[model samples]
Target: MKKVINVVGAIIFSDNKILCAQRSEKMSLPLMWEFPGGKVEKNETEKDALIREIREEMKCDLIVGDKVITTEHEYDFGIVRLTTYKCTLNKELPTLTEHKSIEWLSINELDKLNWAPADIPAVNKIMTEG
Candidate 1:
């Protein structure tokens, strides 16, 4: 059976720019730009999982806000269900522990980078509505 993974992404905003992270070479989707996030472990709520993921992956805390969108995509490895939420960083900076690098880009600049398939819909919505 194909495994289905539930993940949470944090759409962190600062100074009207949104945060985008690049997947490390060791990651599944290497070099793809994505909203920073990780898998939702069992027994954890999406919000709580997002908070924990952000801390573990980014080495910083975040205040998760309203849900922006939930999307799903199928990859060669498995199916991914991604839920994204608006968030604010609790600290001034984040130490990138899992990603290659990070960028803060405006909505218009969002499309300039290649995003993970699961994160594209939420990115489109933000460009169109936010």
Candidate 2:
């Protein structure tokens, strides 16, 4: 089967604390903590989609920074291409829309949460880099 290119995930961080969101129970990978972002729309660039998705889903603005890593994973329904970014929030606090909950966590805390499988590599990269 051909891979479907759709989702992009951003790993925004501040002072060693990364932003994480709890997936809605009704959504795929339900109840798992994840980086903030969503589907890449047809007409938008990855950076644009990152900015828009963050704002729309978290009610926060992001100054997109360096690209950290990109990983592709397959699910029964579709393929997800996760693009992780080193982003920072424009607001002091985020108001979540799609997530059931949100938190800022350190690298050690990162291992504590149940994350989507695709997020594992990105988390490892973060832990290794800093």
Candidate 3:
């Protein structure tokens, strides 16, 4: 199947904890926690999308950090390229969109919660290198 280059998420850290958000029940992969971000726009670069998405979704500014990992997963609807970047919020705003809940979790606390199938690779990436 042809892959749609959609979706981007960030691995934001603060006080040693990684940020995670629960997908809204209306969204696919409902209730599974994920890093905050959204689909890349038609004319936007991934890096730019990261900056814009974070600001729009979380309503906070961010300092986009290094690229930690790039992963891909196949879902029945389409292919997802889930790129993760190490990032920090420019301010302490916590309001979020596209998700039902949010949490700041340490690497050790990652596996305790259920994650989206696409994010499993990210969990492994975090465990091994982050």
Candidate 4:
């Protein structure tokens, strides 16, 4: 059986656009778009993980909102349980240390980028539902 890994992602919004991150060339999904977040620790809840991950990865504050969706997908690395949440920034821009680049994009225009497999369902849902 594939090992299940819980991941949390943030769909941060500002100025009517959602935040998108591009993976670096060294990562598994190079140049693919994804929500800004990482693996959730076993010791914390999804909400806690979302907030902490954002701070660690982006050095920004996140005010978490309603859940967009949760998806389970199998990959060669493992099974990823990705749960996405709607988020708002606390103040200004966040730092970019690991990712190649970041951009704020409209929901309808999100399809222009190549997104990671685990993030497609949430992206599709947001585009159609929002």
Q: Tens digit of lDDT per residue, candidate 2, span 1-130?
A: 7657766666667778876655555233646565555568978876778778667666666677777677776767667676767777565566552355455668777787667666677677778866
lDDT of model 2 at position 95? 53
lDDT of 4 at 47: 78
Q: What are the per-residue Cα lDDT tens digits for candidate 4 across 1-130?
A: 7776877777777766776555444222546565555568988877788777676666777677788777787767678787888887678675552355556668788887656666676777777756
- Backbone clashes in each candidate structure, one number apiece? 0, 0, 0, 0
- The candidate, 2 or 4, that scores higher on TM-score is 4
Q: Is candidate 1 or 3 superior in lDDT?
A: 1
TM-score ranking from best candidate downward: 4, 1, 2, 3
Please give the RMSD to the true structure for each candidate, in Å. 2.9, 2.9, 2.9, 2.7
* Per-model CA lDDT versus the true structure: 0.68, 0.66, 0.65, 0.68
Q: Which is the better candidate, 2 or 4, if ranked by lDDT?
A: 4
What are the runs in model 3 whose C-alpha is more than 4 Å off? 1-3, 25-28, 97-99
lDDT tens readout by residue for model 3, 1-130: 6657766777666776766666555233655555555568878877778877667666777787777666676766677776767777566655553255555567777787556666666666767755
Q: Model 3 reaches what TM-score against the true structure?
A: 0.75
Cα deviation at 70, candidate 2, in Å, is: 1.6
Off by over 4 Å in 1: 25-29, 55-61, 75-77
Whose lDDT is higher: candidate 1's or candidate 2's?
A: 1
Candidate 1's displacement at residue 69, Å, is 1.4
Better model by TM-score: candidate 1 vs candidate 4? 4
lDDT of 1 by residue, 17-128 (tens): 7765564442325465555555688788778887776676666767777987777777677877877888886655765523554466788887876676666776778777
- lDDT, candidate 4, residue 92? 63
Evaluate model 2: give its TM-score.
0.76
Which residue pairs show collisions in model 4? none
Query: Candidate 4, which segments miss by more than 4 Å at Cα?
Result: 24-28, 55-57
